[PDB]
DNA sequence: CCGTTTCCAACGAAGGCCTCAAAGCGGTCCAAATATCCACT
DNA sequence: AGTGGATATTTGGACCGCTTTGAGGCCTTCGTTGGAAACGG
């Protein structure tokens, strides 16, 4: 989803 | 390559029955003790059956001799007969051979 | 009757394990099995049959089997090469377990009811419900579980509870879900990070269940109102913000101090990804509110209802303006702002 | 569990009796006599009763002598009375 | 008899399995050639049964069981609460020539003439220590082996440690026996009780400090109040010293002082209070109270005078 | 609807309104319908506290069948191997008894006890107590098919409590939760129990504090005569018949200053753990011991309101 | 006024329950004798 | 009943998680003991 993608972009 | 003599193979059944009836953990050193007691009991049983058959006047062993022996042992009485013990402690395949039963037009087996 | 022979005991037990039904379990057969167990001991082919008899009649037999281990021997028969031949010829826990209703129903009874004496409808068992046509044929009469939580992971029961609107069921589910969410949380009432992915999976299951039924539960709303001031914004961001989208329609002035104040306080001091996530969540919330309001006009009036969504739009516009001023005019946020205004 | 200690059997073995062993024993002990058709079954029943008596006596002797595991002296003292009671 | 066998069996059952061989070797009652015959790999019950059989085949008296009990107690020595005594001597008395046999004889004869049935067992070990096990009784009862009394005496010193088990009934008699057998005049009990015998030994002998003087990082963080921190650190280091603190576990204070704070100003009666400090390692948690911010820089003198005054129980009045 | 009222009373619990004051517990003669032997049995024992959700379809008419089924379940759980019949008589027994005179108002449900008895009467091995005192805030938001008994007390081993709770949860669809008492409620209980009037003092007043020194460990006990504590409380008490937060603060500050004047230790930086007085004794883990039979209803109502706040 | 029987306060150990770690092997899968048996003659 | 042929039995081989024993902690609750107090001479 979009929220999981934002999360994985935040982790990096 | 296992090797088992028929004597131990025969006594293992009664040893396991003893272990099941004990309902308690038992040390291994008691197995040979139970086997020796079983051997002594079998010797005394054979001697008692021999003397009872000799006193009866016949060479063969009949169920009345074993009934008399069990009565002297305190297990069988007039009220609690052998049939009660057979029904309590023996399966159906042996009860069909020991206790007489009638069926199919008063056909009784065994003949008693 | 052939269970008396010790040679045919396991095979006859395996056959009865397949031929057993509900009308066959009777007390005298239970006593027969009990005396057989007392005479022979702990036999797996007897333990399986006793467990089946307990499942079919829990008010007569109590058995707790320890472990699944192999009860019936899986010895391939002499016709395995024939079994394959006939096959090739014929080619061409957090959530409670699913169990029947408690046996306390009709516990104290003096005589038989007038219904079953006349052989009326009655009810439909729960173990027989295994397919969709069986649910279609018996949708009006069903047996409810002993614990409502087990409904959370069953589609055939979700289809039933989609249109029920019953008070006791809703109360039971509310209490169970509220207690579970309160005890399993990571930052509320306890410092227990040992749960971790378990809470995330539970929230994912709840979200997947509430996407169906096109509505949300009250326990989730209460948990949101309780645990929001203590949230940090990074533990379960995705699941939390997806749960925020399923909020029932209410007046903006009443729901503002409980949710939106804390949301803005966490929004104005976080990173840009948090801003994009809350913008997506607000867009989804507006979509859900509009979808639920569009159906009421076909059936507070509409004048007082449009004011709430107008105030929500003005509030999110103020948020977007302040965020654009703060983030130094980043296009990554303007994209989400325009995506919201598109809807 | 140590190899010296054996836990009680949770499940009992099949109730089939070793008739051949009893026949061979009765033949090797007293070969001059002949047993009847089903005398071995009565001998097996008597042996079952004897083993039950010995088991209960050893159990009570072990539980009364400050022991949770049946030892050699317990079954010894039990046999010293059971063997004398079993003859007649 | 059977009582001796039961006593030995209970004493052996009290002993753990990993250190049973050391206790059996220190006992030295059974011969060395009889130990390897027993297998210590099997269950504890069978080993204890074989040991009881071996001890019954040989003549087992009551002194051997008492010696085994003394050995076990001096090996553990942490299962009882210990108290200290102090004996005084007259001014005109000279230094005595201590003799162990005369001491044993006098200590035995005093209790033998006071009571009638009493068991006394001695064990003289190095560090100049005598362990005494006493089983009490009277003219109409037999000595009770279940409630013994343990005494540790140091020769030519005014101190003696005792285990508080049952001497509350025969305390004056034990004091008389100790002050007569050791050629003293008076005896008094110190306000110092503890379960750790070595800590009491180090405190009473005041040998816990054995240090003598002889010639033979993230600059962006600004720590304010650093002068107060260094001052409290210096005060703590000066008050509690730098030596390893003796291990205690309990302290008790009784207070009969007046309340001084409008509030109970007219009251003329004291406020009765009883305070207890409990910790797995006392004198080490207190030392860390001032740097942690829970107490002031100088602690009250009532808490920093435990090893210096050799006191554990305190009473304070107005 | 009751669901709307439940949601309203739920979302109303905010931290804006000022908490109210409490009345001084007044001794009251208990009703004469209660069994004195049961009251004497309930005193002087330590109980473990639990909060419980309403029970679904619980009937007071059939209590023998419940006991029989629970006995069969416990016996089958003890021996994990063999089967167990329901109507069989075992070595242990389960008894469902009904308590009387334990309710606060006429609208509260009746209390009852579940006891495990080893026959050899036999010896009691475990006791469970379900009660609800002054629970009108909960009885309004619940339908008629449920029974509200939010307070649960257990006395015995935890191994039996686990089985009883599992059976109750599987049968009536409820939820058991441990109940804890923080230092705030303990400090309130201390003052509320000191303000009470007693004829004879049987035990001194004691407080237990745990000093946070995580590398090390240390506990402090503070015992004081009941008469001195009563005088110290009367010195600061000025509101007739009521207890206020400022009065509790002053009562605690008196002891804090008295301790600091002697030991120079700030007792305000520690954590209160246990509070014992002449009427009752309470621990922070959720353990209560009741001594006086006159102030039973007050303690029961306090614990019931705590459980109601926890479950809502 | 003083000695004796009795209820009350209190330390204790005593037992009962809970938890963890380590040594053991029973149970499950699997080989190829081999022995139980049923009637073979 | 000696002879016979066949097919289920099992015991030694091998390996992992279930199993129990030993040890430590810690608690809640009865009992033995010392002592203040009412009663008898």
Contacts of E299 (CB under 8 A, 6+ apart): E239, E286, E289, E290, F263, F264
Q: What's the rounded Cα separation, in Å, for the pair F115 and F238?
A: 46
Q: What's the rounded Cα separation, in Å, for the pair E285 and F215?
A: 8
What resolution, expressed in A, was reported for this entry?
2.8
Give the SS3 label for residue F273: strand
- CA to C1' distance (Å), from D72 to G17: 33
Q: Of the candidates B21, B40, B91, which has its C-beta nearest D51's C-beta? A: B21
Peptide bond into B110 cis (omega under 30): yes
Instruction: Name residue, tokens 């058709």.
Output: D37
Q: Measured CA to C1', what is the nucleotide nearest B3?
A: H11
Binary contact (E294, F263; C-beta < 8 A):
no
Distance from D17 to chain C by nearest Cα, in Å?
Answer: 12
- Cα within 13 Å of Cα(B43), Cβ side: 8
Q: What's the rounded Cα separation, in Å, for the pair F40 and F43?
A: 5
Residue E126's φ and ψ, nearest 5 degrees, are -65, 175
C68 touches strand G (CB under 7 A): no
Q: What's the rounded Cα separation, in Å, for the pair E57 and E66?
A: 19
Tell me the sheet residues that pair with E186: E88
Binary contact (C277, A9; C-beta < 8 A):
no
Cβ proximity of E124 and E133 under 8 Å: no
Q: Of the candidates E284, E292, E300, which has its C-beta nearest F262's C-beta? A: E300
Give me the DSSP letters along E119-142. Answer: EEEEEEETTTEEEEEEE---TTS-
Chain D touched by E22 (CB under 8 Å) = no
Nearest CA-CA partner of E178 in E202, E200, E149: E149
Structure tokens at C94: 């957090």
Angle between helices F226-236 and F245-263 (to 10 degrees): 120
Q: Give the neighbours of chain E: at least 3 Cβ pairs within 8 Å.
A: D, F
Q: Measured CA to C1', what is the nucleotide nearest D10?
A: G26
Residue C157's φ and ψ, nearest 5 degrees, are -85, -30
Query: What beta strand segments (E) does D1-88 contain?
Result: 5-6
Q: How many residues does chain A have?
A: 12
E16 touches strand H (CB under 7 A): yes
Chain C touched by A12 (CB under 8 Å) = no
Instruction: Name residue, tokens 């190899």.
Output: D3
Distance from C57 to chain B by nearest Cα, in Å?
Answer: 29
- CA to C1' distance (Å), from D48 to G19: 44
Q: What's the rounded Cα separation, in Å, for the pair F73 and F85?
A: 10
Nearest CA-CA partner of F267 in F219, F309, F228: F219
Nucleotides of H under 7 A from a protein CB: 11-12, 19-24, 28-29, 33-34
Contacts of E302 (CB under 8 A, 6+ apart): E253, E314, E316, F262, F263
Binary contact (D14, C43; C-beta < 8 A):
no
B6 touches strand H (CB under 7 A): no
Binary contact (B61, D69; C-beta < 8 A):
no
E164 touches strand G (CB under 7 A): yes
C42 touches strand G (CB under 7 A): no
- CA to C1' distance (Å), from B5 to H11: 14
Q: What's the rounded Cα separation, in Å, for the pair D51 and B21?
A: 8
Cβ proximity of E4 and E65 under 8 Å: yes
Residue C156 gets the label, from left (phi > 0), alpha (psi -120 to 50) or beta, of: alpha
Cβ proximity of B22 and D70 under 8 Å: yes
Q: What's the rounded Cα separation, in Å, for the pair D22 and D13?
A: 18
Binary contact (C4, B20; C-beta < 8 A):
no
Give me the DSSP letters along C302-317. Answer: HHHHHHHHHHHHHHHH
Distance from B106 to chain D by nearest Cα, in Å?
Answer: 23
Binary contact (D4, E42; C-beta < 8 A):
yes
Chain D touched by C150 (CB under 8 Å) = no
The CA-based angle E162-E166-E168, given to 5 degrees, is 85
Binary contact (C146, F171; C-beta < 8 A):
yes
Binary contact (D5, E43; C-beta < 8 A):
yes
Name the experiment that determined this structure: cryo-EM
Chain C touched by B91 (CB under 8 Å) = yes
Q: Measured CA to C1', what is the nucleotide nearest F44?
A: H29
Distance from F191 to chain E by nearest Cα, in Å?
Answer: 17
Could you tell me the domains of chain D? 19-86 (1.10.20.10)
Nucleotides of G under 7 A from a protein CB: 9, 12-14, 16-18, 24-26, 28-29, 36-37
Nearest CA-CA partner of F220 in F173, F177, F256: F256
Structure tokens at E213: 């003087």
- CA to C1' distance (Å), from C214 to H39: 87
Distance from C1 to chain B by nearest Cα, in Å?
Answer: 12
Buried b (16+ CB within 10 A) or exposed e, C162-185: eeeeeebebbbbbbbbbbbbbbbb
- For residue E173, CA distances in Å to C76, E87, E135, E308 come to 86, 15, 14, 31
> Chains F/A: 3 or more C-beta pairs closer than 8 A?
no
Contacts of E75 (CB under 8 A, 6+ apart): E19, E23
- CA to C1' distance (Å), from C175 to G18: 32
- CA to C1' distance (Å), from E169 to G6: 21
Structure tokens at C338: 């325009």
Structure tokens at B56: 């009866």
Q: Taking CA atoms, what residue in D is nearest to B92?
A: D15
Binary contact (A3, C271; C-beta < 8 A):
no
Q: Taking CA atoms, what residue in B is nearest to C35?
A: B88
Torsion of CA F272, F278, F283, F289, to 10 degrees: 180
Based on the number of CB atoms within 10 Å of its own CB, is C20 exposed (0-12), middle (13-18) or buried (19 or more)? middle
Q: What's the rounded Cα separation, in Å, for the pair F133 and F45?
A: 20
Cβ proximity of F308 and F138 under 8 Å: yes
Cβ proximity of B17 and D59 under 8 Å: no
Cβ proximity of F130 and F52 under 8 Å: yes
Q: What's the rounded Cα separation, in Å, for the pair B73 and B62?
A: 17
Nearest CA-CA partner of F53 in F122, F120, F127, F152: F152
Binary contact (F221, E275; C-beta < 8 A):
yes
Q: Taking CA atoms, what residue in A is nearest to C336?
A: A2
Binary contact (D71, E49; C-beta < 8 A):
yes
Q: What's the rounded Cα separation, in Å, for the pair E297 and B93?
A: 93
């Amino acid at each position: 989803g979009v929220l999981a993608h934002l999360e994985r972009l935040e982790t990096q | 390559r296992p090797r088992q003599d028929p004597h131990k193979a025969g006594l293992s059944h009664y040893v396991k029955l003893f272990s099941f009836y004990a309902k308690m953990p038992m040390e291994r050193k008691a197995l040979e003790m139970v086997e020796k007691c079983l051997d002594k009991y079998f010797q005394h049983l054979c001697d008692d059956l021999e003397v009872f058959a000799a006193h009866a006047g016949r060479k063969t062993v009949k169920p009345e001799d074993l009934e008399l022996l069990m009565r002297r042992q305190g297990l069988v009485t007039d009220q609690v007969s052998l049939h009660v013990l057979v029904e309590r402690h023996l399966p159906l395949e042996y009860r069909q051979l020991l206790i007489p039963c009638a069926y199919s037009g008063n056909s009784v087996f065994p003949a008693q | 009757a052939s269970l008396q022979d010790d040679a045919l005991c396991p095979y006859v037990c395996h056959l009865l394990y397949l031929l057993t039904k509900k009308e066959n379990v009777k007390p005298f057969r239970v006593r027969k099995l009990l005396d057989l167990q007392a005479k022979m001991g702990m036999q797996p082919h007897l333990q399986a049959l006793l467990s089946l008899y307990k499942f079919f009649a829990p008010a007569l037999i109590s058995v707790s089997l320890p472990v699944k281990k192999i009860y019936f021997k899986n010895s391939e028969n002499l016709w395995k090469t024939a079994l394959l031949a006939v096959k090739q010829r014929n080619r061409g826990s957090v959530i409670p377990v699913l169990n029947s209703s408690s046996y306390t129903k009709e516990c104290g009874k003096k005589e038989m009811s007038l219904s079953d004496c006349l052989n009326r409808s009655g009810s439909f068992p729960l173990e027989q419900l295994q397919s969709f046509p069986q649910l279609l044929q018996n949708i009006h009469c069903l047996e409810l579980p002993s614990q409502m939580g087990s409904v959370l992971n069953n589609s055939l029961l979700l289809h039933y509870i989609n249109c029920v609107r019953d008070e006791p069921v809703l109360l039971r589910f509310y209490y169970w879900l509220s207690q579970t969410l309160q005890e399993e949380c990571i930052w509320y009432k306890v410092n227990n990070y040992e749960h971790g992915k378990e809470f995330t999976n539970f929230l994912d299951t709840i979200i997947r269940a509430e996407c169906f039924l096109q509505e949300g539960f009250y326990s989730c709303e209460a948990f949101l109102y309780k645990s929001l001031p203590l949230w940090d914004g990074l533990c379960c961001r995705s699941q939390f913000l997806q749960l925020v989208s399923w909020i029932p329609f209410s007046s903006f002035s009443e729901v503002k101090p409980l949710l939106f104040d804390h949301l803005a306080q966490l929004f104005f001091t976080s990173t840009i990804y948090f801003k994009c996530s809350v913008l997506q969540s607000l867009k989804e919330l507006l979509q859900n509110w509009l979808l639920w309001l569009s159906m009421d006009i076909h059936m507070t009036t509409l004048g007082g209802s449009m004011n709430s969504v107008s105030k929500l739009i003005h509030y999110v516009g103020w948020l977007s303006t302040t965020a654009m001023r703060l983030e130094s005019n980043n296009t990554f946020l303007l994209h989400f702002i325009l995506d919201f205004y598109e809807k | 569990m140590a190899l010296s200690t054996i836990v009680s059997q949770r499940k009992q073995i099949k109730r089939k009796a070793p008739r051949g062993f009893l026949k061979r024993v009765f033949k090797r002990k007293k070969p001059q006599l002949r047993l009847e058709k089903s005398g071995d079954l009565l001998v097996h029943l008597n042996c079952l009763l004897f083993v039950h008596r010995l088991a209960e006596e050893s159990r009570t002797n072990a539980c009364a002598s400050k022991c949770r595991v049946i030892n050699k002296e317990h079954v010894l003292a039990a046999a010293k009375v059971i063997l004398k009671k079993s003859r007649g | 008899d059977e009582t001796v066998a039961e006593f030995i069996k209970r004493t052996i059952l009290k002993i753990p399995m990993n250190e049973l061989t050391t206790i059996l070797k220190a006992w030295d009652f059974l011969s060395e050639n009889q130990l390897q015959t027993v297998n210590f790999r099997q269950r504890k019950e069978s080993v204890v049964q074989h040991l009881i059989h071996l001890c019954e085949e040989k003549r087992a008296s009551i002194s051997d069981a008492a010696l085994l009990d003394i050995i076990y107690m001096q090996f553990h020595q942490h299962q009882k609460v210990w108290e200290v005594f102090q004996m005084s001597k007259g001014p005109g008395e000279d230094v005595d020539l201590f003799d162990m046999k005369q001491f044993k004889n006098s200590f035995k004869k005093i209790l033998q003439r006071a009571l009638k049935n009493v068991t006394v067992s001695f064990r003289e070990t190095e560090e100049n220590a005598v362990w005494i096990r006493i089983a009490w009784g009277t003219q109409y009862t037999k000595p009770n082996q279940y409630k013994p009394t343990y005494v540790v005496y140091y020769s030519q010193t005014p101190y003696a440690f005792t285990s508080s088990s049952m001497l509350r009934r025969n305390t004056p008699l034990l004091g008389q026996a100790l002050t007569i057998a050791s050629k003293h005049h008076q005896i008094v009990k110190m306000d110092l009780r503890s379960r750790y015998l070595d800590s009491l030994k180090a405190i009473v002998f005041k040998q816990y400090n054995q240090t003598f003087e002889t010639h033979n990082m993230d600059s962006r963080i600004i720590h304010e109040n650093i002068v107060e921190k260094e001052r409290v650190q210096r005060i703590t280091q000066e008050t509690f010293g730098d030596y390893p603190q003796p291990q205690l576990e309990f302290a008790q204070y009784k207070l009969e002082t007046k309340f001084k704070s409008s509030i109970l100003a007219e009251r003329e009666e004291p406020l009765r209070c009883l305070i207890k400090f409990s910790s797995p390692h006392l004198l080490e948690a207190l030392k860390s109270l001032a740097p942690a911010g829970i107490a002031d820089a100088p602690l009250s003198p009532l808490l920093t005078c435990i090893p210096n005054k050799r006191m554990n129980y305190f009473k304070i009045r107005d | 609807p009751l669901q709307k009222r439940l949601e309203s009373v739920r979302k109303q619990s905010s931290f804006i309104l000022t908490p109210p004051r409490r009345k001084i517990p007044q001794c009251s003669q208990l009703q004469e319908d209660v069994d004195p032997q049961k009251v004497a049995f309930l005193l002087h024992k330590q109980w473990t506290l639990y909060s419980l959700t309403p029970l679904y379809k619980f009937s007071y008419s059939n209590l023998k069948e419940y006991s029989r089924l629970l006995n069969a379940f416990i016996v089958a759980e003890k021996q994990k191997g063999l089967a167990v019949e329901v109507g069989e008589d075992f070595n242990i027994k389960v008894i469902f008894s009904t308590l009387l005179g334990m309710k606060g108002t006429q609208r509260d449900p009746e209390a009852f006890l579940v006891q495990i008895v080893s026959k050899s009467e036999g010896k009691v091995l475990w006791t469970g107590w379900f009660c609800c005192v002054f629970g009108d805030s909960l009885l309004e938001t619940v339908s008629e098919d449920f029974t509200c008994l939010p307070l649960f007390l257990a006395n015995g081993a935890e191994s039996n409590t686990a089985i009883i709770g599992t059976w109750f949860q599987k049968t009536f669809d409820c939820y058991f939760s441990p109940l804890a008492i923080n230092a705030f409620n303990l400090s309130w209980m201390a003052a509320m129990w000191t303000a009470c009037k007693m004829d004879h003092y049987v035990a001194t007043t004691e407080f237990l504090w745990s000093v946070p020194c995580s590398p090390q460990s240390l506990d402090i006990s503070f015992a004081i005569h009941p008469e001195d504590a009563k005088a110290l409380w009367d010195s600061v008490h000025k509101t007739p018949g009521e207890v206020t937060q400022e009065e509790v603060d002053l009562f605690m500050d008196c002891l804090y200053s008295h301790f600091h004047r002697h030991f120079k230790i700030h007792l305000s930086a520690t954590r209160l753990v246990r509070v014992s007085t002449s009427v009752a004794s309470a621990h922070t883990d959720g353990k209560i011991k009741i001594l006086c039979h006159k102030y039973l209803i007050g303690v029961l109502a306090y614990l019931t309101e705590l459980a109601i706040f926890q479950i809502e």
